[PDB]
Amino acid sequence: RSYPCDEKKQNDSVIAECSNRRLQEVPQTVGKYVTELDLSDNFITHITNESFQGLQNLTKINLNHNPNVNGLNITDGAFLNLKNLRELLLEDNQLPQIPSGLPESLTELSLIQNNIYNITKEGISRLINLKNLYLAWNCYFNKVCEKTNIEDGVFETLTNLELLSLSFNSLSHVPPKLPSSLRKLFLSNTQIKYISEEDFKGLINLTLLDLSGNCPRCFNAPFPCVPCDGGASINIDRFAFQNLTQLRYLNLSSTSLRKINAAWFKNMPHLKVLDLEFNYLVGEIASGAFLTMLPRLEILDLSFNYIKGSYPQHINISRNFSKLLSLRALHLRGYVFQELREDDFQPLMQLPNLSTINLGINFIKQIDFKLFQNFSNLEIIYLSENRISPLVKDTFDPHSNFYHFTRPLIKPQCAAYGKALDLSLNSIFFIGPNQFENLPDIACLNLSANSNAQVLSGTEFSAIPHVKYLDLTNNRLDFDNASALTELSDLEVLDLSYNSHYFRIAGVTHHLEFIQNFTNLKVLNLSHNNIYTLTDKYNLESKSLVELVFSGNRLDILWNDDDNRYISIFKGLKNLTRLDLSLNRLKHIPNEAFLNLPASLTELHINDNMLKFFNWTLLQQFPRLELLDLRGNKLLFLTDSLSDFTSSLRTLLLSHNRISHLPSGFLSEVSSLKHLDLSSNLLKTINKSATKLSMLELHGNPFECTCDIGDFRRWMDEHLNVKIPRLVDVICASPGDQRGKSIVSLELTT
C-alpha cells in the first residue's frame, strides 16, 4: 500500500487503485511498475502531456467519473505518448469533443455520458487496432444537439472493429460505410424508424444486433421515452438482414411491432435468442408466421405484448411453436389471461429441450397443475404474480439489459435441489387440500408473500414430500403444532423469514418442537418472526442443523425469564457452525446463557443489538470461531489480554461502537486476525504499546493529530502490507488547524 493508491498484484501486470480518493490531479507515487491505472470517482479536471509520462509501462487508464460535482480538460496528445495503452475508459466526464490526439495502441475505447456530438475523422481514423468502441449517451435529450453528427467513413477505416455501441444517442439514419469486421452492433434508443436494405450491406460476420427503443412502448421505461407517430412501428424492409447469415442474438424490444415479416430470418438459421418484449404481437403469437424460421432458438421472450383494456380467458399460442425444437426457456410475462389449460400449451409439450417456462405477471387465477407433467425436461416454472387461490375439491447503469432482467428467476441455491416452482405473490391465503395434486416431483418451492395464514399440522405438502428447498417468506403461518411441515422428510432449507400467525394460544405460544423430527434440515431462517416466548423447551436436539438465523426476534425477553427457563435454548443443535443473534435488542447476555452455545460455531453475529458489556473471557469455549461480528453496539472497552482467550479467530468486526481506548496487549495471542474493524468508534489516538493481519478499518474516528499521533504513522510504515480501506477517510477531528486533513497527508512533528 502506497499513498494515495492502494496497490495489489494480479498476473504479470500491476494495477493501481486511486478510485474514490477525491484527488484533484494525477498522483505522484505511481511507479513505472504500474501497467493499468484506475482514477474514477475523483475531482480531476485536467489532463496534460505531463500527467502521463514515465509510466510508459501503462496499458490502461480508467479515468471515468471526473470531475465529480467545467468538464475535464484533455490536451492534444496527452496520451499520444504511451505506446502500451490498450483500454482507455472515459465515461461520464462532460467531454465536448473526441480527444484530439490519441494513441494507436488503443484497442478498447469508452466515451459514454459526455457531450460528443460531432463524430469526425480528425478524431478516430488512426486507431486501426480499435476493437470495442463505446459511445452511448452523447446526444440524449441535451437539446444543444439535434442529431449526433457522424462524418462519412468514420468507421470504414477501423478495420479491427468488433463492437460498436451507439445506443442511447440521437441518429435518424443508420451510419453508412461501416467495417465488415463488425460482430456486435448496439443501436438501442437511437430514434431509427426506417431500416433499409443497404443499412446492413455486408456485415457478414455480425453476431448480435440490438434495435430496441426505436418507436418505444413505454411500459415502465427507466429513462426518457417518447412513442412514434401514434401507434407507429419501426419500419423494417424484408431484405434488411439478407446478408446477416452469421447472427445469434436479436433484440428488437420496444419497436411497437404489430406484424413480424418472416422474410427477415430467411438467411439466418443460426439465431439463438430472440427478444420481442414490449411490443403488440398477441396476433403473431397466435398466428406464428415467423415461428417457422427458428429451429435453433434456445430462448424466446415475448413479454409485455398485453393489450390495454383486455383480460382474455386463455392464451392464444400458434401451433407453429412446435417448430421450436431447440427452445430451452420460454418467456411469456404479461400476456394477461385468466385461465391456462392443457390445450393452450399443447404446441410446447412436444419440445424436447424446454426447461424454463416464464409466466410471471400474467394475473392468472387458475391453471391445470397436471399439464406440467407432459414436459420431457422442465426444472424452472416461474408463476410469480398471478392470482392462484387455495384449491379445494377437484381431484441506473447503461452497461445493462433494460428490456430483459438477467437475474435468475429462482435462487440458484434453490434451483439446485431439483424442480423449481415459484408461486410467490399469489392469492394462496391458506393451503387448499388439493393445492399440490397433479404436480411433478418438486424439489424447490417458493410460496413467498401469499399472506398465508395456514395452521400447519403436517398434512399440507403431502403431494410433494420430496421438497428440499422451501421458501415461506412473508406469510402468517402457524407452526405451534409439532407435526408442522414434517411430511417434508427430505427438507434441507427452511426459509421462514417474517411470519406472524393469527392463532396465539397461551402456553402454546411458540412451539419449535417440530424442528427435531428433521433428519436432513441444514439452513433454518427465523428472522423477524418476533418470538418472545417458547413452550417447546430449550432443548432443540438436532444434528441436522448447520446454520440458524434468528434476527428480528426477542432474545432479551427470554433471557430475563425470572425462573431462568431459557439458558441452553440452543445447546441441542450440536452441529451448528453459523448463528445470527442480530436485532434481538440485547443488553446483557447472561454469562451462563452465552456459555451454552454450540461449541461448534464458526461464525457468530451479535450485531445491531444494544450491547454494553462483553465478557470476552468466555471465548475459550469457541475454538473453531473464525468470525465475530459485534458491529452496531454500545461497547466501551476491549480485553487487554485477548491472548488468554482465542487463537482461532480470523475476522473481528467491532465498528459502530463507543470504543475510546484501544488497549496495550493487542496481538498478545497469535490472534489469527487478518481482518480487524474499528472504524466509526470514538478513538482520539492509538498508543505505541498497541506479522499476521492484512486488514485494518479505522475510517471516521475522531483523530487527534498533535505529534502524539505520529507513533501510529511510523507503524503504518514499518508494517506496510496491512491494507487500510479508504485511508483518505481517516481524518483529524482536532486540532482546529487539522480538522479535515487525512492522517496520512499530515506534516508530522512541527
Added chain:
Amino acid sequence: RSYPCDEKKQNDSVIAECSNRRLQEVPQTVGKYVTELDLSDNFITHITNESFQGLQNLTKINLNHNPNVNGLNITDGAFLNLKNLRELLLEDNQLPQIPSGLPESLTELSLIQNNIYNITKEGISRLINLKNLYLAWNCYFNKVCEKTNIEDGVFETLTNLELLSLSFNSLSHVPPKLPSSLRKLFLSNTQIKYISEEDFKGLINLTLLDLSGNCPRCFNAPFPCVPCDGGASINIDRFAFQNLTQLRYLNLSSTSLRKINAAWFKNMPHLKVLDLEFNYLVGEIASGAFLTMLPRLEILDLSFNYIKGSYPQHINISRNFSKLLSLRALHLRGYVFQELREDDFQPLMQLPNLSTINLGINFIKQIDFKLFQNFSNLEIIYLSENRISPLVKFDPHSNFYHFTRPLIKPQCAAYGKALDLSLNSIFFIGPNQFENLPDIACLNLSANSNAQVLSGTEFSAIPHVKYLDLTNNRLDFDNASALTELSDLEVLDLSYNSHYFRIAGVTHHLEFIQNFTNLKVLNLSHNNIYTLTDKYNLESKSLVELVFSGNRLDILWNDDDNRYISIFKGLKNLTRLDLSLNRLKHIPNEAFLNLPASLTELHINDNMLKFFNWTLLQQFPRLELLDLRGNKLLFLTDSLSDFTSSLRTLLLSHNRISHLPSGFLSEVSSLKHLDLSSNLLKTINKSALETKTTTKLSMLELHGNPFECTCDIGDFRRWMDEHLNVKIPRLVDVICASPGDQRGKSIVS
C-alpha cells in the same frame, strides 16, 4: 396563571388538568373552586388525609396510572374527608386490596388493572350508594392467584348497582347473591364454562349481558387466550335467561358455539343487538333456529364464523333471515367463500331498515352487483378485503370483538350510497366494472395495485360520483380526459400514486383538473411530481383545498427557464394549501407571489427552509394561518405588523430561533395564536411584544426552549404575571438550560 394544573371552565364548575406533569405529589396549589381533579399519569406514590384536605368540594378524582416507569399507598380513609365525592377512578396503581376508608357518596368506582385478588365487604358493602363498579384485570394471570375470591354476596347490599364489570378475572362461577337493580353486567373472559339456571334470576332489570371470551376461539386474540377442553364451547342451561325479559344487548362473541338453543330468547322480545362473532355457526347460519325469536333485533354480528380448511362455493343464508324485520346492520366477516350470486341474498331484500351490509375479509372472487339494486335502504356496502378482479367484455376500556370505527370515512358517507372496494384485485378498471351497480355517490378503490391508464370513460356506468378515493394505486392520468366523466365530483383522493407510463414531455399532465366546476378537494400527496407539461394557468374556479406534500416543488421551482412560477395562480378559489415534505430550501420570491391571494391556511412545515421573506405576506389579504414548523428558520422580522393584518395563527415550533426582534407585534398587531416552542431561545428582553395598547394575543407556546434563568428572565416573568389574558400552555415543559444549577423545571420557580 395556574400552576401546575391547566384549569378549565366546564358546565358549571372548575376542572383541573394535572395529568401527565411528571408530578410526584398532589400540589396544594390547586384552587378551591375546583370540583374535578385529573391527577392521572403522574409519579405519585402516597395518598393520605393531608393529600386532599382543603377541597371537601371535590366530586371527581382521576389518579389513574400512579406511579409510573412500585404501587400506590392509600391509607385508611384518605378520602373520608371528601364528603362530596361521587366519582373516583383508580386504574393501574398496583393496588393490593380494596382501599379501606372510602365515603358513602361514591356512586362510581373504577379499580381496574390492580392486584386485588379478593373482594371483601370491609371496603365496598358499606358503600350503599355505588352505581358503577369496574373490576376488570385484577386476578388476570398472576400465578399468585388461581381465583378472584369474592365474598359470597359481597354485592348484596349494593342495592343501587347498575353497571357491574367483572371481565378479565379468573372466576369460573357466576357469583351468587347479586343486587336486583343491575342493568349492565360484564363477564367477558372470566372462564365461566357453564351457565346454570339460578345464575340469572332477580335480574329482571338486566338490559346488557356480556359472556364472550369464555371457551374462546383464538383468532387474532390481542391478549392471553386459552381454548376450552379440545374444541369445547360454552354450556348455558336452557332456562338461563328465563327471567331476563328486559335484555337488549347480548355478547356471545368467541364462546365457540356450534349450536344456538333458540330457547334462550323465549323471554327476550326486546333484544336489539346480538354479538356472535368468533364461533362455529356456519350451520346455524344455514338453518336459523334463533333467527325467528328476534323480531326487534337491529344489529347482528356473525363475523369470523368460518370453518378451517374450507372455502365454500356460496354463502348459505337461511330464509329465516326475513324474520329480522328490525334489522339495520348485518355483519358477515370471515365466512370466506368464492361467490355471492343474486339468489344467495334473496332473504335480506325483504327488510325495510337494512342499511349496512358488511362483507369484509370473505375473499370473494366474484359478485353479481345487480343484487344490490334490489335493496331499499342500502347506504353502506362494505366489500373491502375481497378478491374482485377486473371485469371484461393496548386498551382495556375497548370493544375487542366488534370493530366500532365507522366502516366508511363519514366525509365519504355524507354524500350517500357508499361502495368500499379497497383491498381487492382490480389491477385495472374493467370496461364492465360498474355495470349493474346502484347509483353510487361515494366510492373507495384504495390499495388495488390498480395500474389503469385513465381516459375518462372508465367511470361512465356510475357518473354521479362525488367522493372518489383512489389512494395507493399506480394510476396514469396524463390524458386531459382523465376522470372527466364524473362531473359532479367534489373530492378526489390520489395520495400515493405512481404510474408506469412516464412518457417524456407528457410526464405529469394535470390538465384533467380544468374540467371540474364543482371539484372542491384534491389530494395529490406523494406522487413524486417533479415534471409538469402544459401552459401555465391551471385554472380551477372551483377548487378550495390542494394537498401537495411528498412532491418535488424544490426540483420544480429550481427550473432554470422559470417555467413553474405561476403553477398554482390559476387556482383562484383555493383557500387551503399544504406544501410540506417538498424538501424546499428556498421558495423563489416570484414563485411565492404567484400563490392565489385567496389562501387562508398555508402549510410549509417539514421542509428545509432557512430564510422566509415575511414582507411578501402583503399580497395575502385573507391569509390567517401560516405553518412553518419543522423547517430551519433563523431570523424573524421587526415590522411584521406592517405586512399582514389578517394573520391569526403563526406556528414556528422546531426552528433555529434565538433572537426575538424589538418590533414584532404590539398595537398595530396581528391576532391570536403564536407557537414558538422547540426553538433555541435563551432569553426574551421584553422589547419583543411591547405593552402598547393590548395585543389581541390569547395564546403563546414556548416550551422546550434552552432557557437562561439568571436574572435575565426577570423581565418576561413579570410580563407573564401582568398579561394574564395571554395563556401559556404546558408550564412544566418550559425549562431552563443555561445555569447548570437551574437546568430543569423552573421559569415558574
